[PDB]
Design a protein around this nucleic acid. Sequence first.
RNA 1: GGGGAGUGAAAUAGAUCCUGAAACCGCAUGCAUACAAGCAGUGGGAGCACCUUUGUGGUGUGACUGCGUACCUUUUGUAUA
RNA 2: GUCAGGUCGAGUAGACCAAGGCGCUUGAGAGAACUCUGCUGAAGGAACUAGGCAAAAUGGUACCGUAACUUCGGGAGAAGG
RNA 3: GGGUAAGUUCCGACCUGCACGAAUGGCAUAAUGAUGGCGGCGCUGUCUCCAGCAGAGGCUCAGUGAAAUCGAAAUCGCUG
RNA 4: CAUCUCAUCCUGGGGCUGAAGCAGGUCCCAAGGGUAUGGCUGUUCGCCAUUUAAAGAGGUACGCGAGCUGGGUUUAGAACGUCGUGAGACAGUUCGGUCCCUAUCUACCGUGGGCGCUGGAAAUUUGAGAGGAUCUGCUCCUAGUACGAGAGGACCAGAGUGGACGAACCUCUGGUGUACCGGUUGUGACGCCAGUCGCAUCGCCGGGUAGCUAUGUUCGGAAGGGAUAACCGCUGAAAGCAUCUAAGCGGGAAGCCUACCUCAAGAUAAGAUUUCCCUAGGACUUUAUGUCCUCUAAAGAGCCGUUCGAGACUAGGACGUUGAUAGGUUGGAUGUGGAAGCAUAGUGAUAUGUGAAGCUGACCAAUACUAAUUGCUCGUGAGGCUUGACU
Lengths: 119, 211, 54, 117, 122
Amino acid sequence: MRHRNSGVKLGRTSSHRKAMFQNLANSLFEHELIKTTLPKAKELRRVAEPLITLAKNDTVANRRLAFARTRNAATVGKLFTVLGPRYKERNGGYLRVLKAGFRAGDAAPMAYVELVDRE
Amino acid sequence: AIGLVGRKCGMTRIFTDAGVSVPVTVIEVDPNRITQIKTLETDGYQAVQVTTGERRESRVTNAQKGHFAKAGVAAGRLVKEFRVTEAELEGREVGGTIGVDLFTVGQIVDVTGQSKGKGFQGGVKRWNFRTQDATHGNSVSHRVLGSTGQNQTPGRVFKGKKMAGHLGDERVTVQGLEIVSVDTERSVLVVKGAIPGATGGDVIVRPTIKA
Amino acid sequence: AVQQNRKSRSRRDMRRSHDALTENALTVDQATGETHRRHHVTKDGFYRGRQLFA
Amino acid sequence: SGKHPLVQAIENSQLKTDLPEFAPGDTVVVQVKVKEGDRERLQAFEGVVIAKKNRGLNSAFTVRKISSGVGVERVFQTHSPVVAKIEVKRRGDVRRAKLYYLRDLSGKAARIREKLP
Amino acid sequence: MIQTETMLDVADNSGARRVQCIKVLGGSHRRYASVGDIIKVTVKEAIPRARVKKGDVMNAVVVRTKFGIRRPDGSVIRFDDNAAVILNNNKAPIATRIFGPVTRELRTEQFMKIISLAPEVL
RNA sequence: GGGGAGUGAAAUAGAUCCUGAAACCGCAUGCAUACAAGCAGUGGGAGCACCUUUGUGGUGUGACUGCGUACCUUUUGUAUA
RNA sequence: GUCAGGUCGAGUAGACCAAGGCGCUUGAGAGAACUCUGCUGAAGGAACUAGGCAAAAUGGUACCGUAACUUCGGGAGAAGG
RNA sequence: GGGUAAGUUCCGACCUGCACGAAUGGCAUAAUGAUGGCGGCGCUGUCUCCAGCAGAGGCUCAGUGAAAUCGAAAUCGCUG
RNA sequence: CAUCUCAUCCUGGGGCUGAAGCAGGUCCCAAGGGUAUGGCUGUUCGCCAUUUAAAGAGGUACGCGAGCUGGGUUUAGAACGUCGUGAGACAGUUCGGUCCCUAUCUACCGUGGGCGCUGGAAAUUUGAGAGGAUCUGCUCCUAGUACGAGAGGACCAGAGUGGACGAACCUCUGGUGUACCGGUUGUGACGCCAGUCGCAUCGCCGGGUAGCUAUGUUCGGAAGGGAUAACCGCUGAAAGCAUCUAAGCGGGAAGCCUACCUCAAGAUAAGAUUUCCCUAGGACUUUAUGUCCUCUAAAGAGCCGUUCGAGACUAGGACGUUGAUAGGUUGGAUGUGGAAGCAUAGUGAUAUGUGAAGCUGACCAAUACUAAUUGCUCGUGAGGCUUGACU
Ligand SMILES: [Mg+2]
Ligand SMILES: [Mg+2]
Ligand SMILES: [Mg+2]
Ligand SMILES: [Mg+2]
Ligand SMILES: [Mg+2]
Ligand SMILES: [Mg+2]
Ligand SMILES: [Mg+2]
Ligand SMILES: [Mg+2]
Ligand SMILES: [Mg+2]
Ligand SMILES: [Mg+2]
Ligand SMILES: [Mg+2]
Ligand SMILES: [Mg+2]
Ligand SMILES: [Mg+2]
Ligand SMILES: [Mg+2]
Ligand SMILES: [Mg+2]
Ligand SMILES: [Mg+2]
Ligand SMILES: [Mg+2]
Ligand SMILES: [Mg+2]
Ligand SMILES: [Mg+2]
Ligand SMILES: [Mg+2]
Ligand SMILES: [Mg+2]
Ligand SMILES: [Mg+2]
Ligand SMILES: [Mg+2]
Ligand SMILES: [Mg+2]
Ligand SMILES: [Mg+2]
Ligand SMILES: [Mg+2]
Ligand SMILES: [Mg+2]
Ligand SMILES: [Mg+2]
Ligand SMILES: [Mg+2]
Ligand SMILES: [Mg+2]
Ligand SMILES: [Mg+2]
Ligand SMILES: [Mg+2]
Ligand SMILES: [Mg+2]
Ligand SMILES: [Mg+2]
Ligand SMILES: [Mg+2]
Ligand SMILES: [Mg+2]
Ligand SMILES: [Mg+2]
Ligand SMILES: [Mg+2]
Ligand SMILES: [Mg+2]
């Protein structure tokens, strides 16, 4: 049974799952539009919107939290200079998930993930 | 037996003056509206049909819209009938309302709900079957069924044999529960003990059939 | 473990009577005029009045 | 709380409104009503607070003492009228929220450093 | 929760030290005994010159457990050991000194002597 | 891989190329078939569809119905599990 | 058959790394019974079973301490702290 | 007789040896044995009596694609 | 893991008794439910210990190895007693010794698709039938009364509290809780201090929110009605009497039918009730619920999307901008237990203040910030005939 439970498994161990979602968040924050599978895209919101919420207040503890959670100095620098101040006055919902067909070699449902006010 | 339709809201406790804690379930009753009265002359039996709740008008079909507008009531989320007699069908009319004051403190009731669904389950959970040896040479047979019959007499498996399958999600009635409190301003019943289902599901409360 | 008699060609076609395929939900995006899978981005990156990767 | 507002409104009507503040690691004296039929009196239970649970009306706390060579633990329900009075005698300085390790110590090795302000 | 093969301490001074449960009494297929339940025991350890000797088969009443005892308000009372008191064939306690605490579940009429002689009744 | 064009007497003689059977597998048309129990036929027998004549004809199907437990071998004796 | 670095280490054991080399030629989801491989478990503690089978348990260094019996070497890392 | 609440096994004796016996050796014996039997301490999901969780399958979708068997099937129960 | 019989072990109803009472013996009726755990041995059995209301007897390939085991027996090794000149052997004994199969058809447990149900649709229903459940102890009371010289000790009737079994549930008590908080060992990295990441069973250790759970918590087997079995009759002849029977009228059991819970119109006899929808034109001949062409496309259902305390896939529930369906955001609650930076005290490990701080899966409440769209498909156009009643 699975009553009222959150989270996914996606065929991985706990640590592999954590690493993969962290990698996805870093790639998204760099390129601002990425293509993934739809089940991976819908769980990325739950990982990547809290980081933007955190980057809205630029203190040393917040930046050290963001580095413990991203382990990427370029991402921490982009969050507290670009992405945080861009969404300072938006109340959640900083991403956008859009169904985009199926993968050729796989027949897997795919999706685009993009930032809201990009370009 | 005429009763109420409500929603299971949660489970609580009530301390008494003597210090005893009483486990209780809270049932929310939005007052029920009488949508139809079935009588011997046009139906063959006596019953009161009742609606409760609310529905948005874009989810009410034109047939149900006409049925609700034939009385005065507004469309609720479900419709349910109660078998009655006269001296119980006394002052009940379409456009009437049944509230929590139908019951009193200290009454015994039966509550019927829809129990939680456990999915496809095996013999150990569905029928309290015993497991086999865990480590004394046992190969791959721990929670399996074991024997299912005999040998060529009768040469078949009997009907009603206990096997694996779907568990839960049925209609279940619990008899013999007591009313602990009838709150009229919040429109709530509190009864003692556990009642079938999850929080938010539709339950039916009616006076006890044993007495 | 295994059959005692071969299956007639009629009982083999009776099992396959649930093997048929269905169509998908396709709509016309008269913002762009093309056919596309409902609720999906079109082949060139259009959805409900927006364009990705210009 | 994490409950429906209706259950919470029903639970609020029966809270004890003035309870003394205490933490795990303190020593308390609890006064418990006992009633052997017609007669009513109060019995004292004195000992160390080992655990505490904060759930509004479903609060509780566990007390441990050593009586006649045997260790006893009672788990009182906070907002229960059987509990007549609680009084804190001595405050303790601990570094965790559950002092279950004290179950496997005795004597000088089960002493709690008093908290001084 | 006492069952067959459980070892218990002796809370009275009749001469036994360790007893072992060999039968939970009072019902067909009955599993456990709690505080206030009669139990059939064998004596595993005794004091040199007392009335009860090692290897005897006697009745006893359980007076303390680790599992605990629920109370009407929802509270539990646990103890750090399991202890019992030796009885007669008449089911009457046979000692003149109780050791340790005791719960109120023994305020019956056949077990009031343990309550009387007990240092502390909870 | 094919469709036209073209060669040739002939191309379902086109290179897996004379002829091109059967088991097996499709597509199309007609009739039957979702309240009825078994070696699937046989004796009856209504209806429908297409040919034909002015039919007591021909072709296909077969509602309903009586009867009816494969073949070989070996055995006193086999639906024989 | 040969070479074989760093930290700790008695060690070529072991954990993590170097130089160097790889992610092992079907994937994507879901998160039922049951099967395999694991982890934790109230109170009891061999009542299991042909049988404590399997698991759980013990585990290093220094110092203190050690029984019957003996072929005088042992037993002995006895046991225990 | 001992051990257990309870001992067809175990250990100690008795001798009525169906059918022991002295280099196809007799009776013992420190040490040693992945050797046979029996009893303890510790410890435990072995068990009372099973619960929750983690990974690999199962299941669904896309690709590839076996096996033994097989007289033919329009392949129900009971009683004979 | 079962299923049946009755020649009945317990519980229920009786007759007789060398039946005062309690308790027994024996026979009759009764198959609804129930009907131990251990020591020994491979054992079935048997003996013993301690329980129970009781620890029934049997059939089902001495039920059950394509469900598990493999201790005995009955392959190959080796030895003892005994037999044989020997190879070898046994009314014997002893130590050791590979258990294969992905389920086609019938059966069974679950869950769907199709068509039918006299135009179509959305709900709410009746119950022919089926399944489930059905056990019992101890105390009090009547009453230390009836009975008995005493010792003992009731029927009938009422009150409580248990065991075993079952269901539902998570408020309490606990377990689990590898996406929550903390402590700490080794090593590598982030340029370095400080801080904090990877790996080492989740490295190890201490806690713990939801959910799921039992050892936790509630509830059930109540009371009644009908026809009966053995048995007991009333009245009463045959047979002036007698006689429960021949005519006629009764009582009577945990058993039967109801009664309680759940399913149920594929109940092909396919039932009922409320409400909703469809009212255009031309030709035409295989002349009849006949066909063809324009017009039309309803009530509704589904596809699709956001999802669920629902789930293998399905099915089922809610919502899709006139919107709180999911995620995020904001507040709260909870768990952990005193973040980082800085300052102070100390030689230092460290401690204190700032400040119960910082962080906090699944919970409660708000909130359109993100995604639930512009749509498409299916489903028609008044529903044959014959009779009889009302118009
Ligand atoms: Mg959920
Ligand atoms: Mg996979
Ligand atoms: Mg790891
Ligand atoms: Mg579910
Ligand atoms: Mg095997
Ligand atoms: Mg296994
Ligand atoms: Mg048969
Ligand atoms: Mg075909
Ligand atoms: Mg040709
Ligand atoms: Mg050819
Ligand atoms: Mg038909
Ligand atoms: Mg057939
Ligand atoms: Mg022959
Ligand atoms: Mg023969
Ligand atoms: Mg014949
Ligand atoms: Mg056959
Ligand atoms: Mg345990
Ligand atoms: Mg424990
Ligand atoms: Mg044993
Ligand atoms: Mg046993
Ligand atoms: Mg072992
Ligand atoms: Mg191990
Ligand atoms: Mg033994
Ligand atoms: Mg010899
Ligand atoms: Mg010789
Ligand atoms: Mg050797
Ligand atoms: Mg496939
Ligand atoms: Mg009989
Ligand atoms: Mg036995
Ligand atoms: Mg033993
Ligand atoms: Mg057999
Ligand atoms: Mg064997
Ligand atoms: Mg041999
Ligand atoms: Mg709980
Ligand atoms: Mg929990
Ligand atoms: Mg450092
Ligand atoms: Mg490594
Ligand atoms: Mg928040
Ligand atoms: Mg920290």
